[PDB]
Amino acid sequence: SLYGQQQAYAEPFIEMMDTNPEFRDKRSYMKNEHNLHDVLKKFGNNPILNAIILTRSNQVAMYCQPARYSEKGLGFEVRLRDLDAEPGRKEKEEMKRIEDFIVNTGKDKDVDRDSFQTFCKKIVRDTYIYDQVNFEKVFNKNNKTKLEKFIAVDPSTIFYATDKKGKIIKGGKRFVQVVDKRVVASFTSRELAMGIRNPRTELSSSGYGLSEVEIAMKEFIAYNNTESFNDRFFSHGGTTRGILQIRSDQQQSQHALENFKREWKSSLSGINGSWQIPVVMADDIKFVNMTPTANDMQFEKWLNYLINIISALYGIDPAEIGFPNRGGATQQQSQNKGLQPLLRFIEDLVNRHIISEYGDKYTFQFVGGDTKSATDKLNILKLETQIFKTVNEAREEQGKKPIEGGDIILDASFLQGTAQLQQDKQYNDGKQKERLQMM
Amino acid sequence: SLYGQQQAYAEPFIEMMDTNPEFRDKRSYMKNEHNLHDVLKKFGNNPILNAIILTRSNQVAMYCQPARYSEKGLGFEVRLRDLDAEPGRKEKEEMKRIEDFIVNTGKDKDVDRDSFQTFCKKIVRDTYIYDQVNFEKVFNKNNKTKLEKFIAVDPSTIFYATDKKGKIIKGGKRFVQVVDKRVVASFTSRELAMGIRNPRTELSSSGYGLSEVEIAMKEFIAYNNTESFNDRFFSHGGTTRGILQIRSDQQQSQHALENFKREWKSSLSGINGSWQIPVVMADDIKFVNMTPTANDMQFEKWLNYLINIISALYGIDPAEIGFPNRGGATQQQSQNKGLQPLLRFIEDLVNRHIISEYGDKYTFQFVGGDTKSATDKLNILKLETQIFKTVNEAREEQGKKPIEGGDIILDASFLQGTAQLQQDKQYNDGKQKERLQMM
């Protein structure tokens, strides 16, 4: 049921007793807690995590515009599934309409609704915090077959529904929304998407993704309490430099000490009388140091290590978030592993969920920001054509029609060989005139 | 209602009891405080934050001029939605009028009203402090269909309105202005915009954006009290170098100590008698040090770490604000992640809110300051044309009409092949004259 009809089991044979029959709960890795997103919501406010989220969101936001409206190639585009297939006036108009629909996130403009930029900015946060993304579709009521609007829904409230036997359902309504432990609404598979970026095969998770926050929970709390320890020097006591002991047979009366303080403040306090030296005629005086000569941050390398491993979990370069790399440099490759997989994930999700409603012959893809790869591709072609490939063969290979002029291989020598062969060929073929002349 | 008619819930099912029925309040992440912008206004005065705001505002201000009035390409421009579509004298005049309207922020010039430069400078501050931007529109009273003026409004006073049931309203007036906890005025969706740069999907926020100041609140107070700690060495006591103890059987009378001070000041004080050495014949003398030999700033690395993470939250390079990067360099890529997303956000907001009033066929976009990307684009084309693309195909591809001369592929060899083929073709085709001659 979970994926379809199959011979094997890919769901827990025995249900979790404490869970409600109507749905299957999402739980921690070790089954330590049956309620996970509640504690992940607490870490949702962490600065380091939020810094990563915001950096990735800003990176994604640039790509979130259509290509044909952009003077430069950066953006997204819709095209026919086959690159070699020709376009058409009807299909071009349909693709333009679909692109505008995605840009406006609906059939018609509405200021009250999200632009696709904000939708992606929501999706990245939901992907990197909870590792679960969901968005609702609004099919036309006059015609169930077609689509009108689509918007995002928070993943924390959405669960997998279950049948009376407790097994996850396939047919009909499959996803359910829960608020304050009460069932509110449920959705058909087509009506609500489910994107999992970090899936797992073990029966315990039952298909729910694994979020990096759960993995780094210990590290996150360690970072938090380390920061608290550093800040408690100021927000709490212990900032004394030392104690000035003065030996005496009798402890001086508090009035005398107050007058002592008055004299000290009047003579030495502040910039006024800063450089002056007092004089005291007691038996013996000592100054005992309680703190070192100069203070500084503590456990610096510990923080660097923690943030480095946390960054490595998300695949982001620590240098972007203002920390040193414990190895390597101390950007293209960092971007290649960090951003491009996320863009491809969003691409696949949006494609297979939205474009399925219009037709198989179309697809959605991002474009731009990859000049170097295209440069190397063109260099491959430019080196290949010198010896191997004809101009017309390459042009046909890349979904274009040939140009008259012969299927020439571009080299100034090669042309002279063909020209010389043709010139001498015409000389030899001209001797057939003499051959017939004797007749 | 919040976004439209939908099956799911994207707003709190149960209202916050303490909030007024007329609107939904904006609250902290953890619900610790139901009043947030009041405390954010306090941090609005911080120098580091204000430094970031001013740097970004100065960066944006350069772009805020029309392109066609600028000798160089830097500026903004309005164009038809399709780059391949031809322009026209009517449409060109309309676009020029719209550009002048945006420059003057209204139908007619008015010195009393903001230029678009100052409007953007306000918008960046409102975007980076509160993460919420709003500007009012003034439609023509004689004709509601069309627009006359638009100006900015402070986001702190604006809230989402609610119905009698407490749910957020869609139809009619949707945004409400509150001053001193009193409702003053309310606006229709078209009459007042709402820009959220850092949106969230959780029901708790109810669509309100998340500001980086709230995330960095602890860090900001830590920075403030660290600076206070460093400054309190001067503004408060504790600047003594040491104490000069003189042992004696009896404490000298204060008159004797005053005469001692008189002699000391007359002989040693100031530049006069600076290098001299006094002489004293007491039993024993000591000098006990209360502060080290040389003082300096404390907790320097702590400050660098704090400011680095704060900068990383906003995406700004710490080097711009006079701090060292704890990793990396110790500018184009920093600009690419820092400024361009903000420009695109302003672009999308201004487009979808202003240009919607005139027509769909137009769009607003910035231009300039991106020569390297355009250079790489032109290099892609220049490498592609050598083997792959004809001149006329490229010219057609970029919204231009072909030039007579043939759809040639630019390579000195290729032309000789076509010329040689044509030359030999004419030779062979000339033999048809001989073929007919025998007839």
mmCIF file of N, CA, C and O in Angstrom, chain B residues 18-85:
data_model
loop_
_atom_site.group_PDB
_atom_site.id
_atom_site.type_symbol
_atom_site.label_atom_id
_atom_site.label_comp_id
_atom_site.label_asym_id
_atom_site.label_seq_id
_atom_site.Cartn_x
_atom_site.Cartn_y
_atom_site.Cartn_z
ATOM 1 N N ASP B 18 -5.461 37.211 23.937
ATOM 2 C CA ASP B 18 -5.152 38.569 24.373
ATOM 3 C C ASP B 18 -5.136 39.576 23.229
ATOM 4 O O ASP B 18 -5.110 40.782 23.496
ATOM 5 N N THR B 19 -5.151 39.125 21.978
ATOM 6 C CA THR B 19 -5.107 40.038 20.847
ATOM 7 C C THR B 19 -6.469 40.686 20.624
ATOM 8 O O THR B 19 -7.515 40.118 20.955
ATOM 9 N N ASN B 20 -6.446 41.887 20.054
ATOM 10 C CA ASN B 20 -7.684 42.587 19.758
ATOM 11 C C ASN B 20 -8.422 41.878 18.620
ATOM 12 O O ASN B 20 -7.786 41.339 17.709
ATOM 13 N N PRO B 21 -9.761 41.849 18.642
ATOM 14 C CA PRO B 21 -10.477 41.166 17.551
ATOM 15 C C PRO B 21 -10.228 41.772 16.181
ATOM 16 O O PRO B 21 -10.302 41.055 15.175
ATOM 17 N N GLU B 22 -9.938 43.072 16.107
ATOM 18 C CA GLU B 22 -9.923 43.758 14.822
ATOM 19 C C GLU B 22 -8.744 43.350 13.947
ATOM 20 O O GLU B 22 -8.824 43.498 12.722
ATOM 21 N N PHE B 23 -7.663 42.843 14.535
ATOM 22 C CA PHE B 23 -6.481 42.480 13.767
ATOM 23 C C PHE B 23 -5.753 41.343 14.468
ATOM 24 O O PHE B 23 -6.006 41.039 15.637
ATOM 25 N N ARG B 24 -4.839 40.717 13.732
ATOM 26 C CA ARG B 24 -3.963 39.684 14.266
ATOM 27 C C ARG B 24 -2.604 40.296 14.573
ATOM 28 O O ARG B 24 -1.991 40.924 13.703
ATOM 29 N N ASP B 25 -2.140 40.113 15.804
ATOM 30 C CA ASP B 25 -0.868 40.679 16.219
ATOM 31 C C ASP B 25 0.296 39.886 15.632
ATOM 32 O O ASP B 25 0.169 38.711 15.276
ATOM 33 N N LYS B 26 1.442 40.554 15.533
ATOM 34 C CA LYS B 26 2.699 39.924 15.152
ATOM 35 C C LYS B 26 3.518 39.683 16.413
ATOM 36 O O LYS B 26 3.667 40.587 17.242
ATOM 37 N N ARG B 27 4.038 38.466 16.558
ATOM 38 C CA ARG B 27 4.639 38.014 17.802
ATOM 39 C C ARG B 27 6.002 37.392 17.527
ATOM 40 O O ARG B 27 6.375 37.124 16.383
ATOM 41 N N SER B 28 6.741 37.164 18.610
ATOM 42 C CA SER B 28 8.061 36.565 18.522
ATOM 43 C C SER B 28 7.962 35.127 18.015
ATOM 44 O O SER B 28 6.876 34.553 17.883
ATOM 45 N N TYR B 29 9.126 34.543 17.729
ATOM 46 C CA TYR B 29 9.167 33.170 17.237
ATOM 47 C C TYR B 29 8.621 32.204 18.281
ATOM 48 O O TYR B 29 7.756 31.372 17.983
ATOM 49 N N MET B 30 9.115 32.301 19.512
ATOM 50 C CA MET B 30 8.770 31.370 20.576
ATOM 51 C C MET B 30 7.503 31.770 21.325
ATOM 52 O O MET B 30 7.165 31.131 22.326
ATOM 53 N N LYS B 31 6.803 32.810 20.870
ATOM 54 C CA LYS B 31 5.658 33.377 21.577
ATOM 55 C C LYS B 31 6.044 33.928 22.947
ATOM 56 O O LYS B 31 5.185 34.085 23.821
ATOM 57 N N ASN B 32 7.331 34.224 23.151
ATOM 58 C CA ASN B 32 7.768 34.802 24.417
ATOM 59 C C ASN B 32 7.138 36.169 24.644
ATOM 60 O O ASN B 32 6.725 36.494 25.764
ATOM 61 N N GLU B 33 7.058 36.984 23.593
ATOM 62 C CA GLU B 33 6.460 38.310 23.655
ATOM 63 C C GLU B 33 5.489 38.468 22.497
ATOM 64 O O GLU B 33 5.818 38.130 21.355
ATOM 65 N N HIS B 34 4.297 38.979 22.794
ATOM 66 C CA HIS B 34 3.301 39.263 21.770
ATOM 67 C C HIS B 34 3.516 40.612 21.096
ATOM 68 O O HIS B 34 2.745 40.963 20.196
ATOM 69 N N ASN B 35 4.533 41.370 21.504
ATOM 70 C CA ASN B 35 4.840 42.677 20.929
ATOM 71 C C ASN B 35 6.326 42.700 20.601
ATOM 72 O O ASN B 35 7.166 42.692 21.507
ATOM 73 N N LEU B 36 6.647 42.732 19.308
ATOM 74 C CA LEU B 36 7.998 42.502 18.807
ATOM 75 C C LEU B 36 8.636 43.759 18.234
ATOM 76 O O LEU B 36 9.782 44.088 18.566
ATOM 77 N N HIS B 37 7.928 44.465 17.353
ATOM 78 C CA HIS B 37 8.525 45.618 16.699
ATOM 79 C C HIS B 37 8.906 46.701 17.697
ATOM 80 O O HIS B 37 9.821 47.483 17.425
ATOM 81 N N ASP B 38 8.258 46.737 18.865
ATOM 82 C CA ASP B 38 8.660 47.684 19.900
ATOM 83 C C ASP B 38 10.092 47.430 20.355
ATOM 84 O O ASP B 38 10.880 48.373 20.497
ATOM 85 N N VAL B 39 10.453 46.164 20.586
ATOM 86 C CA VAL B 39 11.817 45.878 21.022
ATOM 87 C C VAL B 39 12.783 45.950 19.844
ATOM 88 O O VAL B 39 13.955 46.297 20.024
ATOM 89 N N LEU B 40 12.327 45.628 18.628
ATOM 90 C CA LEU B 40 13.216 45.770 17.475
ATOM 91 C C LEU B 40 13.555 47.234 17.216
ATOM 92 O O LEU B 40 14.653 47.546 16.737
ATOM 93 N N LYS B 41 12.623 48.141 17.516
ATOM 94 C CA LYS B 41 12.899 49.564 17.372
ATOM 95 C C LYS B 41 14.064 49.991 18.254
ATOM 96 O O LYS B 41 14.801 50.919 17.904
ATOM 97 N N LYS B 42 14.246 49.328 19.400
ATOM 98 C CA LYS B 42 15.376 49.650 20.264
ATOM 99 C C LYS B 42 16.696 49.309 19.583
ATOM 100 O O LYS B 42 17.641 50.106 19.602
ATOM 101 N N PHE B 43 16.779 48.122 18.975
ATOM 102 C CA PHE B 43 17.986 47.724 18.262
ATOM 103 C C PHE B 43 18.155 48.463 16.943
ATOM 104 O O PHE B 43 19.238 48.398 16.351
ATOM 105 N N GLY B 44 17.114 49.151 16.471
ATOM 106 C CA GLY B 44 17.230 49.940 15.256
ATOM 107 C C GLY B 44 18.337 50.979 15.283
ATOM 108 O O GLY B 44 18.780 51.424 14.219
ATOM 109 N N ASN B 45 18.796 51.374 16.470
ATOM 110 C CA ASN B 45 19.805 52.416 16.622
ATOM 111 C C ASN B 45 21.227 51.871 16.718
ATOM 112 O O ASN B 45 22.164 52.661 16.868
ATOM 113 N N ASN B 46 21.416 50.557 16.632
ATOM 114 C CA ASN B 46 22.740 49.991 16.840
ATOM 115 C C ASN B 46 23.680 50.434 15.716
ATOM 116 O O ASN B 46 23.261 50.522 14.559
ATOM 117 N N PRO B 47 24.966 50.719 16.019
ATOM 118 C CA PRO B 47 25.873 51.189 14.960
ATOM 119 C C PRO B 47 26.190 50.136 13.910
ATOM 120 O O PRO B 47 26.175 50.436 12.712
ATOM 121 N N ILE B 48 26.501 48.911 14.344
ATOM 122 C CA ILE B 48 26.838 47.850 13.396
ATOM 123 C C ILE B 48 25.686 47.646 12.422
ATOM 124 O O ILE B 48 25.868 47.639 11.195
ATOM 125 N N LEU B 49 24.476 47.488 12.960
ATOM 126 C CA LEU B 49 23.301 47.336 12.113
ATOM 127 C C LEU B 49 23.126 48.552 11.216
ATOM 128 O O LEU B 49 22.906 48.418 10.009
ATOM 129 N N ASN B 50 23.239 49.754 11.789
ATOM 130 C CA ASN B 50 23.084 50.961 10.987
ATOM 131 C C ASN B 50 24.182 51.069 9.939
ATOM 132 O O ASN B 50 23.939 51.572 8.839
ATOM 133 N N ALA B 51 25.389 50.597 10.257
ATOM 134 C CA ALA B 51 26.459 50.595 9.266
ATOM 135 C C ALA B 51 26.098 49.704 8.086
ATOM 136 O O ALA B 51 26.284 50.089 6.924
ATOM 137 N N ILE B 52 25.573 48.510 8.368
ATOM 138 C CA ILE B 52 25.158 47.606 7.295
ATOM 139 C C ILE B 52 24.054 48.256 6.466
ATOM 140 O O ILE B 52 24.072 48.215 5.227
ATOM 141 N N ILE B 53 23.074 48.859 7.145
ATOM 142 C CA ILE B 53 21.955 49.491 6.448
ATOM 143 C C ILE B 53 22.471 50.578 5.517
ATOM 144 O O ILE B 53 22.067 50.666 4.353
ATOM 145 N N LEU B 54 23.368 51.425 6.020
ATOM 146 C CA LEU B 54 23.840 52.553 5.230
ATOM 147 C C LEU B 54 24.694 52.087 4.058
ATOM 148 O O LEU B 54 24.596 52.638 2.957
ATOM 149 N N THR B 55 25.538 51.075 4.272
ATOM 150 C CA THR B 55 26.336 50.539 3.173
ATOM 151 C C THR B 55 25.438 49.981 2.074
ATOM 152 O O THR B 55 25.634 50.272 0.886
ATOM 153 N N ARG B 56 24.435 49.184 2.452
ATOM 154 C CA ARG B 56 23.545 48.612 1.446
ATOM 155 C C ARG B 56 22.736 49.702 0.751
ATOM 156 O O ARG B 56 22.495 49.628 -0.462
ATOM 157 N N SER B 57 22.306 50.718 1.500
ATOM 158 C CA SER B 57 21.554 51.816 0.905
ATOM 159 C C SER B 57 22.400 52.570 -0.112
ATOM 160 O O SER B 57 21.919 52.918 -1.196
ATOM 161 N N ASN B 58 23.664 52.835 0.226
ATOM 162 C CA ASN B 58 24.555 53.502 -0.716
ATOM 163 C C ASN B 58 24.778 52.643 -1.952
ATOM 164 O O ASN B 58 24.847 53.159 -3.074
ATOM 165 N N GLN B 59 24.902 51.326 -1.766
ATOM 166 C CA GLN B 59 25.046 50.437 -2.914
ATOM 167 C C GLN B 59 23.829 50.519 -3.826
ATOM 168 O O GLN B 59 23.964 50.589 -5.054
ATOM 169 N N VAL B 60 22.630 50.512 -3.242
ATOM 170 C CA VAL B 60 21.409 50.523 -4.044
ATOM 171 C C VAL B 60 21.234 51.869 -4.740
ATOM 172 O O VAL B 60 20.728 51.937 -5.867
ATOM 173 N N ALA B 61 21.634 52.961 -4.080
ATOM 174 C CA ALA B 61 21.337 54.297 -4.592
ATOM 175 C C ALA B 61 21.934 54.531 -5.974
ATOM 176 O O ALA B 61 21.370 55.292 -6.769
ATOM 177 N N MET B 62 23.069 53.899 -6.278
ATOM 178 C CA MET B 62 23.689 54.087 -7.586
ATOM 179 C C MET B 62 22.781 53.587 -8.701
ATOM 180 O O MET B 62 22.645 54.238 -9.744
ATOM 181 N N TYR B 63 22.149 52.430 -8.500
ATOM 182 C CA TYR B 63 21.322 51.825 -9.537
ATOM 183 C C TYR B 63 20.039 52.604 -9.794
ATOM 184 O O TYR B 63 19.390 52.380 -10.821
ATOM 185 N N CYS B 64 19.658 53.508 -8.894
ATOM 186 C CA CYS B 64 18.322 54.104 -8.904
ATOM 187 C C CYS B 64 18.234 55.314 -9.839
ATOM 188 O O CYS B 64 17.874 56.421 -9.437
ATOM 189 N N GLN B 65 18.569 55.092 -11.106
ATOM 190 C CA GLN B 65 18.353 56.095 -12.137
ATOM 191 C C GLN B 65 17.972 55.400 -13.436
ATOM 192 O O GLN B 65 18.368 54.251 -13.663
ATOM 193 N N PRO B 66 17.198 56.058 -14.297
ATOM 194 C CA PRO B 66 16.785 55.409 -15.545
ATOM 195 C C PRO B 66 17.960 55.224 -16.492
ATOM 196 O O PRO B 66 18.912 56.010 -16.503
ATOM 197 N N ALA B 67 17.883 54.163 -17.296
ATOM 198 C CA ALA B 67 19.001 53.815 -18.166
ATOM 199 C C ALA B 67 19.142 54.803 -19.317
ATOM 200 O O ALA B 67 20.244 55.288 -19.601
ATOM 201 N N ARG B 68 18.035 55.114 -19.996
ATOM 202 C CA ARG B 68 18.116 55.907 -21.219
ATOM 203 C C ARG B 68 18.566 57.342 -20.962
ATOM 204 O O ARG B 68 19.018 58.009 -21.898
ATOM 205 N N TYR B 69 18.455 57.831 -19.725
ATOM 206 C CA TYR B 69 18.990 59.138 -19.363
ATOM 207 C C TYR B 69 20.444 59.078 -18.912
ATOM 208 O O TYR B 69 21.055 60.133 -18.708
ATOM 209 N N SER B 70 21.007 57.882 -18.755
ATOM 210 C CA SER B 70 22.369 57.701 -18.271
ATOM 211 C C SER B 70 23.284 57.384 -19.446
ATOM 212 O O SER B 70 22.947 56.550 -20.293
ATOM 213 N N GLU B 71 24.435 58.056 -19.495
ATOM 214 C CA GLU B 71 25.390 57.805 -20.569
ATOM 215 C C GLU B 71 25.883 56.364 -20.541
ATOM 216 O O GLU B 71 26.107 55.757 -21.596
ATOM 217 N N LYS B 72 26.056 55.801 -19.350
ATOM 218 C CA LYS B 72 26.460 54.414 -19.180
ATOM 219 C C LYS B 72 25.256 53.560 -18.803
ATOM 220 O O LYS B 72 24.210 54.065 -18.386
ATOM 221 N N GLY B 73 25.418 52.246 -18.956
ATOM 222 C CA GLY B 73 24.294 51.333 -18.855
ATOM 223 C C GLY B 73 23.717 51.187 -17.463
ATOM 224 O O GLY B 73 22.613 50.650 -17.328
ATOM 225 N N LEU B 74 24.430 51.639 -16.433
ATOM 226 C CA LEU B 74 23.943 51.490 -15.067
ATOM 227 C C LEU B 74 22.640 52.256 -14.878
ATOM 228 O O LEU B 74 22.530 53.426 -15.256
ATOM 229 N N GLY B 75 21.657 51.592 -14.291
ATOM 230 C CA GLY B 75 20.356 52.181 -14.064
ATOM 231 C C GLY B 75 19.278 51.118 -14.136
ATOM 232 O O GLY B 75 19.562 49.926 -14.053
ATOM 233 N N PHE B 76 18.040 51.579 -14.288
ATOM 234 C CA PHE B 76 16.889 50.708 -14.474
ATOM 235 C C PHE B 76 16.213 51.032 -15.800
ATOM 236 O O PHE B 76 16.462 52.070 -16.418
ATOM 237 N N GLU B 77 15.347 50.119 -16.235
ATOM 238 C CA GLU B 77 14.738 50.206 -17.551
ATOM 239 C C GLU B 77 13.391 49.501 -17.527
ATOM 240 O O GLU B 77 13.179 48.560 -16.759
ATOM 241 N N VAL B 78 12.482 49.975 -18.377
ATOM 242 C CA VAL B 78 11.199 49.328 -18.623
ATOM 243 C C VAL B 78 11.182 48.877 -20.076
ATOM 244 O O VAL B 78 11.597 49.621 -20.971
ATOM 245 N N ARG B 79 10.704 47.657 -20.304
ATOM 246 C CA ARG B 79 10.698 47.071 -21.636
ATOM 247 C C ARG B 79 9.458 46.203 -21.790
ATOM 248 O O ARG B 79 8.750 45.912 -20.823
ATOM 249 N N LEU B 80 9.203 45.793 -23.029
ATOM 250 C CA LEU B 80 8.140 44.838 -23.297
ATOM 251 C C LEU B 80 8.468 43.492 -22.662
ATOM 252 O O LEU B 80 9.634 43.140 -22.462
ATOM 253 N N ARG B 81 7.417 42.737 -22.338
ATOM 254 C CA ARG B 81 7.605 41.479 -21.624
ATOM 255 C C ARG B 81 8.429 40.496 -22.446
ATOM 256 O O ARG B 81 9.258 39.760 -21.897
ATOM 257 N N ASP B 82 8.219 40.471 -23.759
ATOM 258 C CA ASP B 82 8.949 39.588 -24.659
ATOM 259 C C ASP B 82 10.101 40.367 -25.281
ATOM 260 O O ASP B 82 9.882 41.399 -25.925
ATOM 261 N N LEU B 83 11.326 39.871 -25.088
ATOM 262 C CA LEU B 83 12.491 40.549 -25.644
ATOM 263 C C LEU B 83 12.515 40.475 -27.165
ATOM 264 O O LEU B 83 13.036 41.385 -27.820
ATOM 265 N N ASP B 84 11.961 39.410 -27.743
ATOM 266 C CA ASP B 84 11.916 39.267 -29.192
ATOM 267 C C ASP B 84 10.840 40.126 -29.842
ATOM 268 O O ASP B 84 10.871 40.306 -31.065
ATOM 269 N N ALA B 85 9.896 40.657 -29.069
ATOM 270 C CA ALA B 85 8.841 41.480 -29.639
ATOM 271 C C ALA B 85 9.394 42.838 -30.054
ATOM 272 O O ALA B 85 10.248 43.414 -29.374
#
